[model samples]
Target: GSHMDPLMQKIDISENPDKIYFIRREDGTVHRGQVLQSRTTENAAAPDEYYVHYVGLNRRLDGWVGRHRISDNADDLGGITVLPAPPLAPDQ
Candidate 1:
């Protein structure tokens, strides 16, 4: 069977600490929480680029809120894997 082209790029949902927003580029707009079903293109060219799809989620519940790009030097880079509040316990 033939595979469809991905709509967005899959990223670590744990990466964004605040919100997950979409990224606008020359090729297309990339949104967060997008599911990545395949890695076939990763090795083809531009190894840095990955394909993904959007898995819609609730706004107030456990789901992708939005998407946003961050700088590599940001302090929160270390906290990319940290889950949001409500799901996590209060600081001990």
Candidate 2:
């Protein structure tokens, strides 16, 4: 087969969905951005962009930054020692 582009080249992906996540930037900082409302592939193809959400104001995370992808590994949660699930639920 001829070469073709990927479905989502350099697209932001997360192992855990439908759950709040703290996206840590590369500038030694972090930001809270998660799906406020449920998302779907309501387009012709898998959508990349999502509804923009915001986190609480924090001087620590107030620095200018760009979104970054994350992974389900210790390195992704290295500095993030915060955020937890709600009641009546065990870790996923």
Candidate 3:
């Protein structure tokens, strides 16, 4: 006989791969960045937060920012070309 299935279906994760986003600097200048992780609250009205890894920079300088500070338009940054992530290690 078939029993009841598990209640949990899917767990939410924060990882976003290969997708680049536009982030603003302190002086209002924009730069290209990729989202490494994202966080959301239980309340639906809260804005989502993202951990941004800037392009062509070291990973130690990564930043956490809110959704309001992120932009999707590439034209505003003088046209940012999308780039792919580095290859994963064989043992990874």
lDDT of 1 by residue, 1-92 (tens): 23334743444445543443332222333334342222335453332332333336343422322223322232332234332244455576
Each candidate's clash count:
7, 0, 0
On lDDT, the leading prediction is 3
By lDDT rank, best first, the candidates go 3, 2, 1
Q: TM-score: which candidate is best?
A: 3
List per-prediction Cα lDDT, in the order shown. Answer: 0.34, 0.42, 0.62
Which lDDT tens digits does candidate 2 get at residues 1-92? 23325753423445445555455555535445553333334652433334324356454534322324332232464356443343786578
Q: Which candidate do you rate higher for lDDT, 1 or 3?
A: 3
Q: What is the lDDT of residue 46 in candidate 1?
A: 30
Off by over 4 Å in 3: 1-16, 41-44, 74-92
Q: Tens-digit lDDT track for model 3 on 1-92?
A: 13324732122233436767887655556677887676655743444677888899787767887665566775544334433344686573
Model 1: what TM-score?
Answer: 0.20
What is the TM-score of each predicted model, taking all chains together? 0.20, 0.31, 0.54
Model 1: ten consecutive residues of lowest lDDT? 64-73
lDDT winner, 2 or 3? 3
